[PDB]
Each structure stands twice: as C-alpha cells, then as structure tokens.
C-alpha cells in the first residue's frame, strides 16, 4: 500500500463539481509523463504538490 | 481523461479519412496534443494511429 506524490499542473473550472471540490489534472512526481485527473477540496494552486494514496481510479463527479 | 483519448483519436482518423469539418477536426486534434504532449510520447499504441491521422489529414 504505497503513497504517491503528484503535482497539480492545471486546474479546471467548468466540470460541474459539487460543493467545495474542484477537479484538477496532475502529473506524477515519479513518472512525470503519466498524468491523470483527481478531485480535491481545499484551495489548490496551479503547479503544486499533493499526496495521494489510491492511485487506481480516475475520479468522477 | 486519458483512457478516452485514443478512441477519440480513432474518431478523428475516421473524420479525416472521410474528411468533414476539417478545421474543427484539426483544431481539437491540436488541443489534445498540446494538453497532453508528454503522455503521447510516453505511450506506444498512439504511434500507428497517429501515422494514420497524419497521412489522412
């Protein structure tokens, strides 16, 4: 059960997210080509670091 | 998202081969490439598909 470092590269606006969550696109700190989309709450900035745990799923709405 | 990407590529390949709304097609193509310029050169199975779209377009 590893932990992965990742970085937000670009923050979406118009997904139609619910409540204090915004979707965002991240590139892996490890494999800096592999890039996915996750959802996240809290004020979150372009080009910054985020820790995650479950590296499996592309987040829905 | 990225799983959705290559199927869209095949659709654009079909679009170019049976060309229609070609400025639209080129436009969305370039958008996909620029927003993911790294992961495409990471993958492999793009290669043949991208050659198809290259020739057709």
């Amino acid at each position: 059960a590893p932990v992965k470092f990742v970085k937000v590269t670009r923050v979406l606006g118009r997904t139609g997210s619910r409540g204090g969550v915004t979707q965002v696109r991240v590139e892996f700190m490890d494999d800096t080509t592999r890039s996915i989309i996750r959802n996240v709450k809290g004020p979150v900035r372009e080009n910054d670091i985020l820790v995650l745990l479950e590296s499996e799923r592309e987040a829905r709405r | 998202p990225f799983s959705t990407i290559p199927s869209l590529l095949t659709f654009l390949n079909l679009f170019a081969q049976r060309e229609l709304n070609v400025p639209l097609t080129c436009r969305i193509l370039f958008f996909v490439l620029k927003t993911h310029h790294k992961q495409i050169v990471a993958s492999r199975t793009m290669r043949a598909t991208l050659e198809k779209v290259r020739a057709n377009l």
Binding site: R14, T15, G16, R61 | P1, T4, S7, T10, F11, L14
Partner: peptide, 17 residues
Amino acid sequence: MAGERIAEALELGMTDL
C-alpha cells in the same frame, strides 16, 4: 456534464465501430 456527454458518446461509437 458536457465532456462526459461526449465521453459516453465516444464510447458508444467505439462499440458501434
């Protein structure tokens, strides 16, 4: 919901092809 709409439509067209 917009890109999601085109996502499912893409999926449907893949099945069609």
